[PDB]
Amino acid sequence: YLHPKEYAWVLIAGYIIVFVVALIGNVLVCVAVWKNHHMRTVTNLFIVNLSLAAVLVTITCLPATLVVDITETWFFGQSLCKVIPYLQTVSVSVSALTLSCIALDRWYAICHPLMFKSTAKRALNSIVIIWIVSCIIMIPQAIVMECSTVFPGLADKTTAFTVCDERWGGEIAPKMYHICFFLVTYAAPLCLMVLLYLQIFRKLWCRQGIDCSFWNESYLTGSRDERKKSLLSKFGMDEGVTFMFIGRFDRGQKGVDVLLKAIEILSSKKEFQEMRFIIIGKGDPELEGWARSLEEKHGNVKVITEMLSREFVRELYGSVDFVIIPSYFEPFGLVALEAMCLGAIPIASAVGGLRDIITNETGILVKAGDPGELANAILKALELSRSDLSKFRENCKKRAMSFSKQIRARRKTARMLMVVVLVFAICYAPISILNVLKRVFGMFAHTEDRETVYAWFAFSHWLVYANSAANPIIYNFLSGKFREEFKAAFSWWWLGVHH
Numbered sequence: 118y119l120h121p122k123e124y125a126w127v128l129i130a131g132y133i134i135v136f137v138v139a140l141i142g143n144v145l146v147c148v149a150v151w152k153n154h155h156m157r158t159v160t161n162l163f164i165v166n167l168s169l170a171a172v173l174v175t176i177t178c179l180p181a182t183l184v185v186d187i188t189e190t191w192f193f194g195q196s197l198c199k200v201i202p203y204l205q206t207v208s209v210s211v212s213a214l215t216l217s218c219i220a221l222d223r224w225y226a227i228c229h230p231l232m233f234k235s236t237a238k239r240a241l242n243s244i245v246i247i248w249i250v251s252c253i254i255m256i257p258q259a260i261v262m263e264c265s266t267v268f269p270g271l272a273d274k275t276t277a278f279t280v281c282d283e284r285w286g287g288e289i290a291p292k293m294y295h296i297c298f299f300l301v302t303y304a305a306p307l308c309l310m311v312l313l314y315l316q317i318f319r320k321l322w323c324r325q326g327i328d329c330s331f332w333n334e335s336y337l338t339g340s341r342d343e344r345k346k347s348l349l350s351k352f353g354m355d356e357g358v359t360f361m362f363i364g365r366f367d368r369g370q371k372g373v374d375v376l377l378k379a380i381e382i383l384s385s386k387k388e389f390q391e392m393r394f395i396i397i398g399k400g401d402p403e404l405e406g407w408a409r410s411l412e413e414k415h416g417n418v419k420v421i422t423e424m425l426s427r428e429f430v431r432e433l434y435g436s437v438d439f440v441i442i443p444s445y446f447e448p449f450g451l452v453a454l455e456a457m458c459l460g461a462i463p464i465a466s467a468v469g470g471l472r473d474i475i476t477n478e479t480g481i482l483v484k485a486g487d488p489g490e491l492a493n494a495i496l497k498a499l500e501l502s503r504s505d506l507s508k509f510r511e512n513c514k515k516r517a518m519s520f521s522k523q524i525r526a527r528r529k530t531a532r533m534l535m536v537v538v539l540v541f542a543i544c545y546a547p548i549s550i551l552n553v554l555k556r557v558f559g560m561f562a563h564t565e566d567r568e569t570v571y572a573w574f575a576f577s578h579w580l581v582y583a584n585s586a587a588n589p590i591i592y593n594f595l596s597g598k599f600r601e602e603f604k605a606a607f608s609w610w611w612l613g614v615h616h
């Protein structure tokens with residue numbers, strides 16, 4: 118009789134630790150969202166769902182798995198031989214489908230051009246769908262689980278035990294079921310989340326975000342008046358209200374065609390004589406020739422096709438009155454953040470990130486396709502410029518800092534969510550390969566070392582339950598709001614504060 122295992126001490130200890138940690142942590146997640154209305158976000162409603170799935174399996178499956186792995190015997194009868202494996206797979210499905218909808222919700226918010234944000238009622242409905250789908254697609258698992266009894270002995274049996282395992286009537290079905298199980302609970306959702314989070318990362322960290330250490334007013338000297346006077350002097354222009362465009366020259370993207378048409382519109386107006394235009398860029402030679410014809414015709418229009426250093430551009434932002442951003446399409450809007458940080462108040466098409474950045478007290482928005490709209494906005498800016506614009510310049514700087522912090526907050530949430538996904542991928546990797554190798558490829562049949570293989574399965578099961586314990590710990594280290602509410606919990610229980 119084989120009896121005892123060398124690793125039972127650590128398996129029992131690790132299950133006790135994970136049980137306590139997973140139960141308390143996931144309950145506190147629920148408590149944090151339920152007790153604090155400011156935590157009620159679609160992301161956090163999904164996170165609550167994850168914690169409910171983890172509580173479910175922590176209570177109904179973890180204790181059974183410990184006993185089975187230690188004893189290789191099923192003590193809990195026929196109904197629980199079906200119910201517990203069913204709950205386990207339903208919870209895995211809930212976890213991976215919840216993680217998936219977390220990722221899709223973030224992709225629409227951050228990556229989609231209209232930046233969709235889901236209501237809490239909509240999130241709840243999604244949560245209901247997740248549970249219904251999961252309970253339905255795991256019905257086969259409940260069907261296939263069976264207890265078998267074994268009679269060990271030579272002649273007359275004197276003892277017996279019952280084990281709980283899958284019952285297949287052919288070699289094809291278990292292969293197909295467990296192929297699908299790997300794809301539905303692990304492989305497909307992971308691929309979906311890696312792709313979605315790669316674009317999110319790419320938008321949040323690399324295409325969006327400004328060098329807040331380079332683009333600031335502190336590197337500028339003297340008053341804005343002194344600097345504008347000297348900029349126009351260096352550019353051979355008279356004093357006046359100064360508008361700047363900087364960007365590649367194209368039709369349908371950066372809008373220089375709209376600005377140049379708008380300049381033609383303005384040029385027959387008496388107000389045109391008070392305005393100065395600085396047009397910086399390169400591209401379509403037909404658009405370049407249009408700009409150069411206008412610069413030659415009009416003393417108050419300057420065109421720069423040469424490459425400027427970043428220090429030079431920063432001086433421009435810190436000298437001009439207004440920056441004109443007549444984009445058709447502008448997902449990120451670095452010009453607006455850069456210009457606003459240096460006090461230049463933006464006149465921009467209401468598209469994309471420009472519409473996100475610019476408010477009614479921090480710039481002038483115009484229809485992205487309309488040259489007459491841009492001309493009217495430039496005229497309004499001239500009249501604004503007849504008075505002190507300092508309050509407006511301060512509003513721009515403050516708004517740009519606030520946006521930068523806002524980008525930063527989205528980064529912290531996204532980084533935390535990617536860590537959760539990574540920890541899910543790791544914790545479920547071992548069981549997934551063992552399950553595929555065993556059920557699809559028929560390995561471990563011949564038990565030349567059944568001991569090592571059984572040990573690998575027991576570690577892999579524990580690691581699955583450890584995932585339930587890890588998620589609240591991740592939120593504590595990577596989320597300041599969860600950390601504070603966790604702290605509130607520990608103080609209400611150990612101390613009794615009730616904050």
Ligand SMILES: Cc1ccc(-n2nccn2)c(C(=O)N2CCN(c3nc4cc(Cl)ccc4o3)CC[C@H]2C)c1
Nearest residue numbers: 178181182185201202205206209548549552578581
């Ligand atoms: C214990 C445990 C935990 C997680 C598992 N997982 N694999 C992939 C994803 N998650 C598995 C596992 O290999 N699964 C999942 C469902 N199954 C299962 N058997 C169980 C036995 C006990 Cl005592 C308790 C729960 C049980 O769930 C039988 C099918 C099989 C494929 C088993």
Ligand SMILES: [N+]
Nearest residue numbers: 397423424425
């Ligand atoms: N430039």
Ligand SMILES: [N+]
Nearest residue numbers: 483484487491
């Ligand atoms: N416009």
